[PDB]
Design a protein around this ligand. Sequence first.
Ligand SMILES: *[C@@H]1O[C@H](CO)[C@@H](O)[C@H](O)[C@H]1NC(C)=O
Ligand SMILES: *[C@@H]1O[C@H](CO)[C@@H](O)[C@H](O)[C@H]1NC(C)=O
Ligand SMILES: *[C@@H]1O[C@H](CO)[C@@H](O)[C@H](O)[C@H]1NC(C)=O
Ligand SMILES: *[C@@H]1O[C@H](CO)[C@@H](O)[C@H](O)[C@H]1NC(C)=O
Ligand SMILES: *[C@@H]1O[C@H](CO)[C@@H](O)[C@H](O)[C@H]1NC(C)=O
Ligand SMILES: *[C@@H]1O[C@H](CO)[C@@H](O)[C@H](O)[C@H]1NC(C)=O
Ligand SMILES: *[C@@H]1O[C@H](CO)[C@@H](O)[C@H](O)[C@H]1NC(C)=O
Ligand SMILES: *[C@@H]1O[C@H](CO)[C@@H](O)[C@H](O)[C@H]1NC(C)=O
Ligand SMILES: [Ca+2]
Ligand SMILES: [Ca+2]
Lengths: 594, 594
Amino acid sequence: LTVASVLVLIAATIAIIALSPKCLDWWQEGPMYQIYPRSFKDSNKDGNGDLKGIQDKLDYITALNIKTVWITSFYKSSLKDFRYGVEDFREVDPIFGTMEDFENLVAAIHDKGLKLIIDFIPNHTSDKHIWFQLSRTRTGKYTDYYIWHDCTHENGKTIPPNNWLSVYGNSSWHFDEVRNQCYFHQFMKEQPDLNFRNPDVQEEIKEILRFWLTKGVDGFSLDAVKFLLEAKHLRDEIQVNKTQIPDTVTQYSELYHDFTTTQVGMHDIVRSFRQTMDQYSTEPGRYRFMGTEAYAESIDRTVMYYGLPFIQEADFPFNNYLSMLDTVSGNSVYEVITSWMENMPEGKWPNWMIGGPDSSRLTSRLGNQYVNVMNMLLFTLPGTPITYYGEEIGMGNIVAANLNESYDINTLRSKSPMQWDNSSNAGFSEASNTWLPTNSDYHTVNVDVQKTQPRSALKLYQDLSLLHANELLLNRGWFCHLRNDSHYVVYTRELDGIDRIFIVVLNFGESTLLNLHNMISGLPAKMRIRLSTNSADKGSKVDTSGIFLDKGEGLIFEHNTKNLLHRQTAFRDRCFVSNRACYSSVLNILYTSC
Amino acid sequence: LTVASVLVLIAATIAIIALSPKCLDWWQEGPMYQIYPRSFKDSNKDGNGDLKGIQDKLDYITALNIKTVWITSFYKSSLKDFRYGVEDFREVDPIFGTMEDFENLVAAIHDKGLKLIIDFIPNHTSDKHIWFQLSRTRTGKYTDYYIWHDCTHENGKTIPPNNWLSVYGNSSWHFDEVRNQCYFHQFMKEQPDLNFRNPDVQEEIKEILRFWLTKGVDGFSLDAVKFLLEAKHLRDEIQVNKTQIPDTVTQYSELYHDFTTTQVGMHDIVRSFRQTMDQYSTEPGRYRFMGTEAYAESIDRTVMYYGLPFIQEADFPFNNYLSMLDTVSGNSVYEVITSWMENMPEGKWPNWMIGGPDSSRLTSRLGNQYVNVMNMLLFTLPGTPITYYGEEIGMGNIVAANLNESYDINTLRSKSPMQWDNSSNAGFSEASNTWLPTNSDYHTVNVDVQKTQPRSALKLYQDLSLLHANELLLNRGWFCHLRNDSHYVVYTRELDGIDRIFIVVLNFGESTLLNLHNMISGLPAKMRIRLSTNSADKGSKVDTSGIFLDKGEGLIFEHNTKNLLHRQTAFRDRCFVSNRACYSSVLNILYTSC
Ligand SMILES: *[C@@H]1O[C@H](CO)[C@@H](O)[C@H](O)[C@H]1NC(C)=O
Ligand SMILES: *[C@@H]1O[C@H](CO)[C@@H](O)[C@H](O)[C@H]1NC(C)=O
Ligand SMILES: *[C@@H]1O[C@H](CO)[C@@H](O)[C@H](O)[C@H]1NC(C)=O
Ligand SMILES: *[C@@H]1O[C@H](CO)[C@@H](O)[C@H](O)[C@H]1NC(C)=O
Ligand SMILES: *[C@@H]1O[C@H](CO)[C@@H](O)[C@H](O)[C@H]1NC(C)=O
Ligand SMILES: *[C@@H]1O[C@H](CO)[C@@H](O)[C@H](O)[C@H]1NC(C)=O
Ligand SMILES: *[C@@H]1O[C@H](CO)[C@@H](O)[C@H](O)[C@H]1NC(C)=O
Ligand SMILES: *[C@@H]1O[C@H](CO)[C@@H](O)[C@H](O)[C@H]1NC(C)=O
Ligand SMILES: [Ca+2]
Ligand SMILES: [Ca+2]
């Protein structure tokens, strides 16, 4: 009998190994906390943030159950704004420390189990770059590193070869008196676009990627992908106003950009970036993440960066939606969620971010009442929640100050220093005359004040990430949304074998009442609030038929049943999942077939 | 001692297996002989060629050392010309036999060691197709199988949504009175373009590919790849003449086609076609070939179909060059060869074809004197030589006849029936009033006459394919061309370890004399002609300094030396190879490292 029982065990183990799904990578589980390196924490007492200040506050990052950091671009740049025109990719600016300060930051990050991500701008460079200074003199192989074209430039003004306009001004062809030819920049006067059609240039970007990968940056995040390649035929773009007179079109909005955005072969360059990073992802635990971050485009063009089922391009493109939305309601939020889940290919991992560097703050664009409900929506979605720095608490925008450095007046309100304490400059730096004035109402909004008091908008961010990390329904579960309303958004998170669902209700309306008996069938007489926007109500009792919800109010309901909505014939076109799996309570393991 | 000698043998075998390069596939070695199914051979005595007639003449195909057939598109088509508008992809027309006649043809081909290739047109369909007849009525899923757009069509004339013109006429948007909407065809009034943005349509093409792959067609050959996808924004194309008045542009030449050719995502559809055929290529000997056949475009766009080093797209695109060349000289032929070898990525397999269906005959475009020299150029190049039907001998064009069927007046001169015998209709068919009049001078030009007489332009095609198949220098060897001349084209074929080179000299001039001592160094006082255009110098003696060459004269010199040009520092930018390998005379095996 034992001789049969010994193989029945080996057959059981080989079945578990064959039925166990692939474990979620570090970029799939755990939220991200995007950090601005200049407005997070200062250590050397100079006025600007540094990489050492992020290492000192590393314990606070783990306190929020954060997995990845995604530090914003920190390079030796002559232009700190406008897509971060870099003049030296291998070196770091005098600010943010030195190369040794960066090596100690990534090492301390790996000791606490965290992951790092750095921004990468392969599209353009700076005017002070060693490649551009050698290109104007036609020195060696660098003579064709940029898009150069012969243009006429007489006594008074320059004439571009075409009407191609830059995103931040006029005349995206500028003339220089050294090379006597116009160069294509498309972003700014001091940001020449790096010609990617040169095989030498495409290989030079590989050396920059491998340089940081050996340091252990644990992935990249491309900035401008759709501006890589342009049309070889320097033809004029189609104007939006056909009757418009020429010599007047100077705005990037009044022009159809069909020859300077998303050209043939642009994705193949993105496909080659993943192939280079794949050489460093051979380790079982050391996987490399790659983000495209293509903003200001339609939904069908964003989902193209996910790749094809037979060729890998990128893990996921950064979800620009939910950030440009100024006025939120039941229909605007529902349209954004369905636009991403319906256009994304199946088996991919979505993502969501409420705010970012080039966007207004949450409480300044939506309001202080929507800070709690938007944080729950970020953690109750199947995608990877991405959080901006200072977004876990309610940090308002600041007025535009006149800085001597070349910085964008707009989109600078989000670069305010992090409010740590209630001391001078909100504890961001012990020095005076900081690079940006700290927000005025910092004595009432800071990490130290919100930690000591209950019912604050800091504990809600803590237990949401804890609920997202501990519970398996939020990590890898189905997403079944319930129709469309203008005063409430309700969706259900479920998984096979759990015998328990999560009902998330977000108001986004005007203090209306919800009847849960009209949306989901089979709910009992009473249901418990697992997580309330106002902590004073967690673990309370509310009946389904009639729920009092305020403006900025959101609830999470935990119901025990084996009546998952994803199994019913009605909820088949409104249920999405990335990794279909079945849970087993008896044998605590993940199953594919069930 | 023996205990050490036994492992020294195993170490030798495991070294040979590890150093042996990959064997050349069936599409890399052996020439192709493209056959027109309607003008090759008739069996049922009806007037038109059939697939059974190709089976009867299969022994002649093997007599030319031909590896692949590449039968031109033979489907149930309502339009036999203009890119072969098909109305039924799963069935065959009444002509060319039935489905059983095709199954007996592919089976007889595999018995003689030959390979088959069929043409595939996934771009468009016919008006009588079951998909188009079901699309005009909006019946089920077929309502979006074609590019439909709402257009105005009042009493007198239709108005297209844009100025997009077809390749064969005006107004590539036509109106139908059933669906009351304009459909996009881009080729002809009865050739609606199949909308590929529909996930259903892209999957329906997979079922057509798998249908023929189970029959054993041994690969496909796509017809129109650059016309698959179009721009979703129905914007007007840029006119070549800016001052041109609208309502007059009706020619495909006077318009820049930037929104209807080579769109973003077109290659991804081609990448998916190879992924479907890869499921049938798992066998070691049963490999599937895929050709793109993108004509009328630049060289940088044609080499993009070769694929990337990390994703396979196609084996090789069909080389449209060397066919549009009407007047041949030393510079026109040299530019074509260098344009393909310099733009093609390394490790790929090139190709060459002198003529085709949509091109004039060789002796009618170049002359009867250039028939012999162009056949040698096809077999002395590293690519896969592709030969049109009737091209091995000198077959002239015919005058344009008025046929009752919808056929193109031009490009029909190449569809003349094959001249087999000197009987009625040149032995093509025993019936009268054939579909196309056989060329008049068939009593002097036929396969039977050229076989019995020596010094004909049929034996030169036989021993060239024999020399290309037997000798390894022509199969997989280096290609080092010697500078540029206007009265002779000289290149050298060599391989490491052979200790012997092949010097090919083609005149393409006006009966000039060549001094071989000025081009290649190290040649002896006398050299032998392995293969000559005029089959009389085969084994003669000619000194290097001074060689008498006529207008249509070509020579192959076989020199024994270990001074290969590809090893010298001067001939490094003019030497190309696909599979770099080293030969060993002692051990008759192929080596990678040497
Ligand atoms: C165009 O050039 C002029 C001259 O500097 C400048 O004042 C103007 O701001 C430019 N247009 C835009 C939109 O920046
Ligand atoms: C822009 O379009 C409008 C037509 O609606 C008209 O003002 C004109 O065609 C254009 N404006 C100017 C100043 O030309
Ligand atoms: C800062 O916080 C501490 C404790 O919360 C408090 O005692 C102190 O009065 C505060 N100082 C200012 C300037 O707000
Ligand atoms: C739901 O969506 C449709 C179209 O988007 C809209 O017409 C309808 O008013 C919406 N229903 C509610 C309750 O908002
Ligand atoms: C345009 O339409 C007219 C009407 O049939 C036709 O005669 C003409 O041939 C068309 N143009 C071309 C280039 O075919
Ligand atoms: C085409 O271009 C030429 C200018 O070279 C001129 O004839 C005109 O602009 C165009 N022709 C017509 C008939 O409009
Ligand atoms: C055809 O060929 C045979 C042998 O070559 C010859 O005897 C006969 O006279 C020829 N007939 C015609 C009509 O050319
Ligand atoms: C070779 O090519 C160059 C440019 O294509 C041309 O100027 C030159 O005349 C050519 N030399 C000969 C002998 O044809
Ligand atoms: Ca660029
Ligand atoms: Ca099409």
